[PDB]
């Protein structure tokens, strides 16, 4: 009764956690903390440019799926 | 310059600068502050807009 021909329970968990985050809009400013990093994941524009090394390469993003450059891996 | 048939009334209107004195008893109104926020949009080639 439990044949679980679709492999979507218990696997497709692990691919919408990466296929679902949207871009963060909206975000909120507290007098208080004035500068966090929750601020700088929405300045920073990311840049795509070389370092000419290949660790240097993979941190940046360069190597990237889409065609705009992508860190984080 | 003879006078002619009618005679006739001006009508004026002047605009005056003033300091003022603006006085306000304690307690008279009630305010509701919310979280601010912060949104970004239309990114220019060069720039982004907040």
Request: charged fraction near 25%; glycine fraction near 8%.
């Given at each position: 009764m439990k044949v679980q021909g679709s492999v979507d329970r218990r696997r497709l968990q692990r691919r919408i956690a990466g296929l679902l985050?949207?871009?963060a809009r909206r975000l909120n400013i507290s007098r208080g903390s004035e500068f966090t990093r929750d601020v700088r994941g929405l300045?920073?524009?990311?840049?795509?440019?070389?370092?000419?090394?290949?660790?240097?390469?993979?941190?940046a993003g360069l190597l990237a799926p889409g065609e705009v450059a992508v860190a984080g891996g | 310059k003879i006078h002619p048939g009618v005679a006739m009334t001006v009508v004026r209107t002047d605009e005056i600068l003033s300091e003022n004195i603006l006085f306000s008893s304690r307690a008279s109104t009630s305010m509701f502050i919310?979280?601010?926020?912060?949104?970004?949009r239309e990114a220019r080639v060069?720039?982004?807009?907040?």
């Amino acid at each position: 009764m439990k044949v679980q021909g679709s492999v979507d329970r218990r696997r497709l968990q692990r691919r919408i956690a990466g296929l679902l985050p949207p871009p963060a809009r909206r975000l909120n400013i507290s007098r208080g903390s004035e500068f966090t990093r929750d601020v700088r994941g929405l300045v920073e524009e990311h840049a795509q440019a070389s370092s000419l090394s290949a660790a240097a390469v993979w941190r940046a993003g360069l190597l990237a799926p889409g065609e705009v450059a992508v860190a984080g891996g | 310059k003879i006078h002619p048939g009618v005679a006739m009334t001006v009508v004026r209107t002047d605009e005056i600068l003033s300091e003022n004195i603006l006085f306000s008893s304690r307690a008279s109104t009630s305010m509701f502050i919310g979280t601010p926020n912060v949104s970004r949009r239309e990114a220019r080639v060069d720039a982004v807009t907040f």
